[PDB]
C-alpha cells in the first residue's frame, strides 16, 4: 500500500576497528573517526572518493591504497519520517543489500543483525517507531576480521578462493580472483525502503508451468499462493487471478479464500510457449494476483510479475559436462557467456545491467551461466 | 576403552618408529543416534584430531562401533580436518590355540587376539593378602578364592565361583592335561601355555604371507595389578610370553609352521633389505639333526626354506640361525596335546633359549 524510499543522502562515519568490535550506537558515536556524506545505494569507497579522501582505484596501482580500509568500520546514519499505520498493519524496514556484518538500530533499539550481503533483510519496526525524527543507524564491521572467529579445515585452505571468503557468506571475487580485483568494500549497496503491509497480504506467489503444448497453443499453470490472513477475514477475501498480454485478457478466475494457502490450477488456452533465443519467441504473460474483499471490493495486496510457459529438463549421461538441455521437449544447443561481476563496487551493478544484457543480445546468446 | 594419550606417547612413537592405530573413545556397544550426543562427540573428535594430526606415527582413525556416530559424525570430522589418514567405521571359544577357529580364520589382519597367563609369583605376593596368594580356595584346584576372583576382574562384589579365571585352568588342562596343585608349577604351566599360544599365532601370520598382512595381539602390559591375558603385569613382571614373542618378532626370523605330512621351515623378513644366513634345526630330546642349510630371505616376504619330515611322538625342535655373525634362536613344539609338565620344562632347559 505504501513504500517510502530511504535512499539518498546519509551520514557515514568511518574509523579503524579497535580490538573489540563496535556494536552499539554509543561506541560508534564516541569513537574517533572521519565523517563524510554518503549516498545509498552506494559503496563506502565511492563516498570517500566523493570527498577527496581516496584516489581513483580504477587507475594505476591505486587499488592497493584501499587496503587499510578493509579493517575499518562504517557507521551509516539518517532520520526518516514515520508513515501512519492503522490497526493490523505492519511497518517493514527493507534492506536490499547489507555488506555485510552490521547491527541495525531504529530509535536506539536493535531491530536486526545482518550477516549476509547476498540476500535481503526485512525487519518489522512496527513497535519501535515513534513520531517525528526516527533515527536509523547501521554499524558495519570488518569482514576480514570476522574470518578469524572460525576454525577452518584442511580442505578449506590453499584453494583459489581467499581463506577469508570461506567462513563468511559474501561474494568470493570481492577478495581477489583472476578477472576481478580485490575490492571488499562495504555499505548499503542496494535499495533501502519502508514497506507497509495490510493484515491481508500475499506472502509469496509461486508460479510453476506444468504442461506446455507449443503447437496447439496450450499450457497448464499452477499457482502456489501463500497469504497472511486473519481468521476474521476468512471466507471474506477472494483471490483474483488475471493472465494478460499486450493489454488483452486471456484468463480471469476468482476463488474464495477458505485457507491461508491454496493451489490454483489453470488450463490456459491460446497462449504461446517461452522459448530461448533462436528456438522461438520469448513469450511472456503478465500474471497478477490480488486479495479483494468480497463485500467492499477493497484490494488488500497485489503481486504482478511476467511469467513464461516453459518446461526444462536436463538429460545427463555421466560417464555413460555430459548433459543436454531440453526446453519444451526439444533438445537445444546452448551457446552463451559466463556472467562475471559488473563492478567491484557492486552498488553500481544496477547501472550496468541494461548495457551488459544488450551485449548478449548482439552476441545472440541463448544461455548465460552466472558465475558463483 | 582408554582415554586419549597425550603428546609424549606419540612423540615416543615417532622417535622409535611405532605406527599408531587410534580408536575413538567408545567401547563395545551401540550409542545414541540423537543430536545432543553427536554434538558432544563432534567437539571431541575435532579436538583430538587437530591435536594428533602432525605425528608421523599415527596412521589410522577408527570408531570401535546404520550408526550415525560410526558412519557419519566421525567420518565427517576426518573428511574435513584430516584427509591424509584412513578412517575405518568398524578370541571366540578361547580353546586350544591350534583349533580350527584360529588356524582357519580368514582374516588377513587380526586386531585382537590373546591368551591367558598367570602373573609372576612376586606380582601375586604383592597383589593378594598373605592368606590369599595361593589361588585354590580350600586347597582344591580349579576353585578360586575371592581375592583371585576379584582381580580377574569383577566390576561388582557379586561373590561367585568360576568365570573368567577358569580360562587359566581350562587352557592348562588342555595342553598339559592336569592343572598342577603347586603354585610355582601352576605359574610355569599357565605362562607356558600363554607363551606357546601367542608365539604360535605370530608364527602363523608371519608364515602365511603374502595373504596375512598383520597381527595385533592383546596385550603387552596391564594397567592394574590384575590377572589378565597380557604378557606383562602393572609392576614390571614380564610373563614368559614376553620372551617367547621377542624371538618371533625379529626383523628376520626363522620359524617352523605345522603341516599335514611334516613341517615347514620358513623365514620372514619385515624389512626392505635382503639377508643370507644358515639355519640349523635339531631335536632337543634325542639330539639328532633334522635340517641344516643356507637360506636366502628376500625383502618383505616369507620364504620357504625346507620341508621337515614328520617327527615321532612328542618333543621340541630348536631353530638356530645366524645372520651377519649374530646367532638368533627359536623353537617349535611338535606333537599333539596333552603333554607332561616335567617333560616340557626339561625340553626348555636344554634348548637354552629361555630361562625357567
Question: Is A153 within 8 Å of B81 (Cβ atoms)?
Answer: yes
Residue among B42, B78, B81 with most chain A CBs within 10 A, to mutate: B81
Contacts of A359 (CB under 8 A, 6+ apart): none
CA-based nearest residue in chain A for residue B80: A153
**Any chain B CB within 8 A of the CB of A153?**
yes
Distance CA(B89)–CA(B79), nearest Å, equals 13
Phi/psi of residue A68, nearest 5 degrees: -60, -25
List of E strands, B300-342: 302-308, 315-323, 326-334
Phi/psi of residue A38, nearest 5 degrees: -120, 155
B-chain CB neighbours of A154 within 8 Å are: 80-83
Distance CA(B24)–CA(B44), nearest Å, equals 9
Residue among A153, A157, A159 with most chain B CBs within 10 A, to mutate: A153
Q: How many CB pairs under 8 A join A and B?
A: 11
Distance CA(A324)–CA(A118), nearest Å, equals 30
DSSP class of residue B54? S
Report the gap between the CA of A152 and the closest CA in chain B (Å).
8
Strands A218-228 and A201-213 turn out to be antiparallel
Cβ count near B70 (within 10 Å): 21
A-chain CB neighbours of B50 within 8 Å are: 151
CA-based nearest residue in chain A for residue B77: A153
> What is the phi-psi region of residue A311: left when phi exceeds 0, alpha when psi lies from -120 to 50, beta otherwise?
beta
CA-based nearest residue in chain B for residue A154: B81
- The resolution, in Å, is 3.1
Q: C-alpha B51: how far from its chain's center?
A: 30
Report the gap between the CA of A160 and the closest CA in chain B (Å).
18
A-chain CB neighbours of B83 within 8 Å are: 154-155
DSSP class of residue A84? P
Contacts of A297 (CB under 8 A, 6+ apart): none
Strands A34-40 and A134-140 turn out to be unpaired
A-chain CB neighbours of B80 within 8 Å are: 153-156
DSSP string covering B275-295, please? EEEEEEEEETTT--EEEEEEE
Query: How many angstroms separate the first and last alpha carbons of chain A?
Result: 36
A-chain CB neighbours of B81 within 8 Å are: 153-154
3-class DSSP state for residue A294?
coil
CA-based nearest residue in chain A for residue B46: A153
Distance CA(B44)–CA(B49), nearest Å, equals 9
Report the gap between the CA of A156 and the closest CA in chain B (Å).
8
Question: Is A288 within 8 Å of A242 (Cβ atoms)?
Answer: yes
B-chain CB neighbours of A150 within 8 Å are: none
Cα distances (angstroms) measured from residue B217 to each of A41, A306, B220: 71, 73, 8
Q: C-alpha A276: how far from its chain's center?
A: 25
Question: Is B55 within 8 Å of B13 (Cβ atoms)?
Answer: yes
DSSP class of residue A19? S
CA-based nearest residue in chain A for residue B79: A155
Distance CA(A39)–CA(A31), nearest Å, equals 22
Q: C-alpha B9: how far from its chain's center?
A: 21
* DSSP β-bridge partners for residue B293: B279
Report the gap between the CA of A169 and the closest CA in chain B (Å).
19
Q: Residue A120's closest CA among A138, A140, A99, A137? A: A99
B-chain CB neighbours of A159 within 8 Å are: none
**Any chain B CB within 8 A of the CB of A68?**
no
Distance CA(A299)–CA(A111), nearest Å, equals 30
Distance CA(B285)–CA(B343), nearest Å, equals 9
Give the B-side interface with A, CB within 8 Å: 50, 79-83
Question: Is A44 within 8 Å of A92 (Cβ atoms)?
Answer: no
Look up residue B161 and give its three cell numbers: 565361583
Instruction: Give kind and range of the element (H or E) at residue A101.
Output: strand A101-106
Instruction: Give kind and range of the element (H or E) at residue A137.
Output: strand A134-140
Cβ count near B231 (within 10 Å): 28
Question: Is B77 within 8 Å of B42 (Cβ atoms)?
Answer: yes
Q: Residue A169's closest CA among A101, A228, A225? A: A101
Residues just before a chain gap in chain B (C–N exceeding 2.5 Å) are 65, 90
A-chain CB neighbours of B47 within 8 Å are: none
**Any chain B CB within 8 A of the CB of A154?**
yes
Q: Residue B323's closest CA among B269, B283, B243, B244? A: B269
Distance CA(B241)–CA(B119), nearest Å, equals 10
Long-range contacts of B73-78 (CB under 8 A, 24+ apart): B73/B38, B73/B41, B73/B42, B73/B45, B74/B24, B74/B41, B74/B45, B76/B42, B77/B42, B77/B45, B77/B46, B77/B49, B78/B45, B78/B49
Look up residue B82 and give its three cell numbers: 584430516
B-facing residues of A in 112-151 (CB < 8 A) are 151
Radius of gyration of chain A (CA): 25
Phi/psi of residue B259, nearest 5 degrees: -145, 165
Report the gap between the CA of A207 and the closest CA in chain B (Å).
37
Report the gap between the CA of B77 and the closest CA in chain A (Å).
9
Distance CA(A49)–CA(A320), nearest Å, equals 56
Report the gap between the CA of A225 and the closest CA in chain B (Å).
34
Q: C-alpha B335: how far from its chain's center?
A: 22
Question: Is B268 within 8 Å of B207 (Cβ atoms)?
Answer: yes
**Any chain B CB within 8 A of the CB of A158?**
no
Phi/psi of residue B232, nearest 5 degrees: -150, 150
Distance CA(A358)–CA(A351), nearest Å, equals 13
Look up residue A181 and give its three cell numbers: 580485483
Q: Residue A277's closest CA among A338, A214, A316, A333? A: A333
Residue among A152, A154, A155, A167 with most chain B CBs within 10 A, to mutate: A154
Q: Residue B85's closest CA among B47, B51, B53? A: B53
DSSP string covering B198-256, please? HHHHHHHHHTTTTT--EE--S-S--SSS---S-SB-SSS-B-THHHHHHHTSSSEEEEE
B-chain CB neighbours of A153 within 8 Å are: 80-81
Question: Is B330 within 8 Å of B255 (Cβ atoms)?
Answer: yes
B-chain CB neighbours of A151 within 8 Å are: 50
Q: C-alpha B97: how far from its chain's center?
A: 12
CA-based nearest residue in chain A for residue B47: A151
B-chain CB neighbours of A155 within 8 Å are: 79-80, 83
Cα distances (angstroms) measured from residue B184 to each of A257, B70, B228, B288, B344: 94, 46, 18, 32, 15
Report the gap between the CA of A166 and the closest CA in chain B (Å).
13
Residues just before a chain gap in chain A (C–N exceeding 2.5 Å) are 320
Q: How was this structure determined?
A: X-ray
* DSSP β-bridge partners for residue B265: B256, B306
- Among candidates A151, A154, A156 on the partner chain, residue whose Cβ is nearest the Cβ of B82: A154
Residue among B51, B80, B82, B84 with most chain A CBs within 10 A, to mutate: B80
**Any chain B CB within 8 A of the CB of A157?**
no
CB contact under 8 A, A155 and B82: no
Distance CA(B223)–CA(B231), nearest Å, equals 12
Question: Is A335 within 8 Å of A365 (Cβ atoms)?
Answer: yes
Strands B109-110 and B214-215 turn out to be parallel
Distance CA(A169)–CA(B97), nearest Å, equals 62
Question: Is A192 within 8 Å of A111 (Cβ atoms)?
Answer: no
Q: Residue B117's closest CA among B173, B186, B205? A: B186
Report the gap between the CA of A151 and the closest CA in chain B (Å).
10
Amino acid at each position: 500500500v505504501s513504500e517510502q524510499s530511504l535512499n539518498g543522502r546519509w551520514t557515514l562515519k568511518f574509523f579503524p576497528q579497535p580490538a573489540v568490535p563496535v556494536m552499539t550506537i554509543e561506541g560508534a558515536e564516541a569513537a574517533n573517526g572521519i565523517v563524510v556524506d554518503a549516498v545509498v545505494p552506494g559503496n563506502v569507497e565511492i563516498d570517500m572518493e566523493a570527498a577527496g579522501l581516496v584516489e581513483d582505484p580504477m587507475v594505476g596501482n591505486n587499488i592497493y591504497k584501499l587496503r587499510p580500509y578493509e579493517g575499518y568500520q562504517w557507521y551509516y546514519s539518517r532520520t526518516f519520517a514515520a508513515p501512519v499505520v492503522t490497526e493490523g498493519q505492519r511497518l517493514v524496514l527493507h534492506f536490499g543489500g547489507i555488506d555485510t556484518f552490521a547491527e541495525v538500530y531504529v530509535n536506539g533499539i536493535k531491530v536486526g543483525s545482518a550477516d549476509n550481503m547476498l540476500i535481503e533483510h526485512d525487519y518489522d519496526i512496527t513497535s519501535v517507531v515513534k513520531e517525528g525524527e526516527n533515527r536509523l543507524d547501521v554499524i558495519i564491521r570488518s569482514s576480514v576480521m570476522e574470518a578469524q572467529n572460525h576454525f577452518l579445515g584442511t580442505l578449506s585452505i590453499g584453494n583459489f578462493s581467499n581463506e577469508e571468503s570461506a567462513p563468511v557468506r559474501r561474494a568470493p571475487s570481492t577478495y581477489g580472483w583472476d578477472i576481478m580485483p580485490r575490492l571488499v568494500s562495504a555499505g548499503l549497496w542496494r535499495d533501502v525502503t519502508l514497506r507497509v503491509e495490510n493484515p491481508v497480504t500475499i506472502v509469496d506467489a509461486n508460479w510453476v508451468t506444468l504442461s506446455v503444448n507449443p503447437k496447439a497453443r496450450e499450457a497448464s499453470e499452477s499457482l502456489y499462493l501463500q497469504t497472511r490472513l486473519p481468521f476474521e477475514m476468512h471466507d471474506k477475501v477472494k483471490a483474483v487471478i488475471t493472465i494478460s498480454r499486450d493489454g488483452r485478457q486471456i484468463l480471469r478466475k476468482e476463488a474464495l479464500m477458505r485457507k491461508f494457502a491454496n493451489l490454483f490450477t489453470l488450463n490456459l488456452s491460446g497462449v504461446d510457449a517461452w522459448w530461448p533465443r533462436g528456438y522461438g519467441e520469448p513469450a511472456l504473460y503478465t500474471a497478477e494476483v490480488s486479495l479483494v474483499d468480497v463485500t467492499s471490493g477493497k484490494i488488500y495486496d497485489t503481486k504482478t510479475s511476467k511469467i513464461g510457459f516453459r518446461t526444462v529438463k536436463l538429460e545427463l549421461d555421466e560417464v555413460n559436462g555430459q548433459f543436454q538441455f531440453i526446453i519444451n521437449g526439444e533438445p537445444v544447443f546452448a551457446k552463451g557467456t559466463n556472467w562475471v561481476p559488473l563492478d567491484a563496487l557492486h552498488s553500481r551493478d544496477a547501472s550496468h545491467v541494461e548495457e551488459a544484457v544488450q551485449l548478449m543480445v548482439e552476441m545472440n546468446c541463448n544461455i548465460v551461466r552466472c558465475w558463483g | 576403552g582408554n582415554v586419549y594419550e597425550d603428546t609424549h606417547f606419540f612423540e615416543l612413537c615417532d622417535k622409535y618408529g611405532i605406527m599408531v592405530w587410534q580408536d575413538f573413545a567408545m567401547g563395545c556397544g551401540n550409542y545414541s543416534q540423537r543430536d545432543n550426543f553427536a554434538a558432544a562427540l563432534e567437539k571431541e573428535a575435532i579436538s583430538v584430531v587437530v591435536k594428533l594430526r602432525n605425528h608421523p606415527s599415527l596412521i589410522l582413525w577408527s570408531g570401535n562401533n546404520n550408526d550415525r556416530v560410526s558412519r557419519q559424525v566421525l567420518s565427517r570430522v576426518i573428511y574435513e580436518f584430516d584427509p591424509t589418514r584412513p578412517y575405518l567405521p568398524s578370541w571366540g571359544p578361547r580353546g586350544y590355540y591350534k583349533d580350527p577357529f584360529y588356524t582357519e580364520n580368514p582374516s588377513q589382519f587380526v586386531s585382537e587376539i590373546g591368551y591367558h597367563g598367570c602373573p609372576n609369583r612376586e606380582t601375586l605376593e604383592r597383589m593378594f593378602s598373605p592368606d590369599s596368594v595361593n589361588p585354590w580356595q580350600n586347597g582344591v584346584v580349579g576353585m578360586w578364592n575371592d581375592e583371585w576372583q576379584t582381580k580377574a576382574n569383577r566390576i561388582y562384589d557379586d561373590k561367585f565361583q568360576g568365570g573368567r579365571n577358569d580360562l587359566m585352568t581350562n587352557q592348562v588342562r588342555i595342553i598339559f592335561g592336569e592343572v598342577p596343585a603347586d603354585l610355582d608349577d601352576f605359574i610355569f604351566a599357565s605362562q607356558s601355555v600363554q607363551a606357546e599360544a601367542m608365539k604360535f599365532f605370530v608364527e602363523l601370520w608371519r608364515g602365511r604371507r603374502p595373504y596375512r598382512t598383520g597381527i595385533i595381539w592383546w596385550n603387552i602390559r596391564d594397567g592394574w595389578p590384575l590377572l589378565s591375558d597380557a604378557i606383562s603385569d602393572y609392576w614390571g613382571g614380564k610373563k614368559q610370553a614376553f620372551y617367547y614373542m621377542q624371538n618371533v618378532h625379529h626383523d628376520v626370523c626363522c620359524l617352523i609352521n605345522p603341516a599335514a605330512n611334516g613341517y615347514m621351515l620358513k623365514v620372514d623378513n619385515n624389512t626392505l633389505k635382503d639377508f643370507e644366513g644358515v639355519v640349523e634345526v635339531k631335536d632337543v630330546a634325542s639330539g639328532k639333526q633334522v635340517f641344516k642349510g643356507k637360506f636366502v630371505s628376500k625383502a618383505n616376504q616369507m620364504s620357504e626354506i625346507a620341508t621337515l619330515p614328520m617327527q615321532k611322538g612328542q618333543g621340541m625342535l630348536v631353530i638356530s640361525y645366524r645372520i651377519e655373525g649374530n646367532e638368533y634362536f627359536n623353537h617349535y613344539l611338535y606333537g599333539e596335546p596333552p603333554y607332561k609338565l616335567d617333560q616340557y620344562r626339561k625340553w626348555v632347559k636344554k634348548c637354552g633359549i629361555y630361562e625357567l
